[PDB]
Curated annotation (Swiss-Prot), chain A:
It comes from the Eukaryota. Belongs to the eukaryotic ribosomal protein eS27 family. PANTHER family: 40S RIBOSOMAL PROTEIN S27 (PTHR11594). Component of the small ribosomal subunit. The ribosome is a large ribonucleoprotein complex responsible for the synthesis of proteins in the cell. Required for proper rRNA processing and maturation of 18S rRNAs. Component of the small ribosomal subunit. A zinc finger (C4-type) spans 37-59. InterPro entries: Ribosomal_eS27 (IPR000592), Ribosomal_eS27_Zn-bd_dom_sf (IPR023407), Ribosomal_zn-bd (IPR011332). Pfam families: Ribosomal_S27e. GO terms for molecular function: RNA binding; structural constituent of ribosome; zinc ion binding. This is Small ribosomal subunit protein eS27. One of its GO terms (biological process) is translation. GO terms for cellular component: cytosolic small ribosomal subunit.
Amino acid sequence: PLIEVDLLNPTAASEAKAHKMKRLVPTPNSYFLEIKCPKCGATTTTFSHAHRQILCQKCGQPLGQPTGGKLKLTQQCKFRIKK
Amino acid sequence: EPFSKKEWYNVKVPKNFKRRTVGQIVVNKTAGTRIASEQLKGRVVEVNLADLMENEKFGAYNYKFKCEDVNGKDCLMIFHGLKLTTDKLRSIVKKWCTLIETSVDVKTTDGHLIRIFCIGFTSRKSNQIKKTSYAKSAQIKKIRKIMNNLITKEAASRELTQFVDYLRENKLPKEIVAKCSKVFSMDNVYIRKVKILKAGKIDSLKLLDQHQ
Amino acid sequence: TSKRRNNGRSKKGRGHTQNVRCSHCGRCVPKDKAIKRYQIKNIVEAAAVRDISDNSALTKYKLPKTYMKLEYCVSCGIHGRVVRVRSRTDRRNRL
RNA sequence: UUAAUA
RNA sequence: GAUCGCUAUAAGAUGCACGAGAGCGAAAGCAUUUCACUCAACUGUGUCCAUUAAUCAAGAACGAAAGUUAGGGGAUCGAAGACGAUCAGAUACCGUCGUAGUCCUAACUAUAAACGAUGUCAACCAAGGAUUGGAUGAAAACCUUGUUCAGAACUUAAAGAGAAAUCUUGAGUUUAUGGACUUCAGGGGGAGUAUGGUCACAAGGCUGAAACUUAAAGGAAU
């Protein structure tokens, strides 16, 4: 670009827009989360971009469907980000 | 004189249509081993649909009938096929859209076996900005399978006579658009041609039921 | 050398295209290179439209039109005045 | 429609 | 009893309009819709290995059309050929007929203006608008928008390069000359010819000079 920004201190917004690899220090866009079951109270921890059917550990209200890039959680499944 | 031996017969279409007489057909008078009622047995009469219904909202459809017997100077016709008018068929082919075509072989309840051709077109949208409106190969097959199954249910359940009168009502084209609109934006859906692959068995009483 | 950047064709990401026949010469030209024009005209000329409408047996029958797509080779497009030879700097205009 | 050469 | 008109048939071939500076493929090439069998690529990934990579004499698959061999098919068109015109002549252009061929199967052939006339891999790289296939937010599959990855392209440049035309997803970063590798060229003819070798049933293909002759031949632009 003709106009140039600092290459050591990129903004929070600028790094978020960039590709997951083309950042200053590459970081994954994925995360680990747990899903409370609709059927029971147990929380099953799983990858954000899981590539298989996600079942509860108790039963199996299947909690997610793998769809080419991110888990398709059911509309009644609530999750939080595991930090 | 060439026309000294010629006779004119009245043409009668079944009761399904508002107009019962469509014209006159010519045939030579009888001879030694040539009976006119025997000769008028494979004549196919083509008439527009804007004449059998006496309304010009049906004008872009040509209907064909064949003669099955001569009942005293009257040729009792039976339905032989339908086809879109040539001007209408070429007037609905837009350039920057996907054309969807299909054909189904359906056996009616009364025994007739017919072939039905359907045409469709991916459409624009109200807020569409990009010029082209194409569909992926997956969406085309989904749409074709829908219009293939939907047209079979409506045609196999009813006899040939009542199915044809159904085609006059826009229920089938309207229902196809309202059921393929969950896959892609379709606007023009027409049944361009209906054939009769195998003529089912008919009876004089059944024909008499078909003619008054 | 290269009079045109696209070599006079419309083929970019492929190696072969099917042939079409010139509507006037009968020549074989590739589908992209052919000069494609569309025509939509009434089946009755502007002089005779009044005559047909006078003595007609139909209530308000609307006269149909004819639609056909004409494809011309380069030689028969230039000769038939379908396209003209343009300026060196006006060749680039695509509108 | 036909129109070769210096 | 033609041309013309309607209705019926059975093979051959073809696949309009949709059809595009759109898609796929190593290239040649690929277009009626259904079902199988495959294959490749893009995107997504806190999955695995840990240098396995790039380019490659010899060597090997695929290689348009024409052509060859043997069956089937033989509709349309049509090298050869036969007529009729035109012309001074016409063995041609125009018209009519028409054999091989055009089509399928098996096996050869291995050549094209096989072209982007631009080798393969890699890094950096000025402003855009649009499009094809994904991922990801917003706005209720389709469509309108933000970001980002991959693909075929397009426009502007007072800049870089070049003999100029022009190139900008390079033909830029080169007398301030060196990122890696392979192939090819040395004025024009003679000539891709002769001979020798080798492949093919054949046509031909691959390798391939010399004698002699000549001050030019050639490229872009006014």
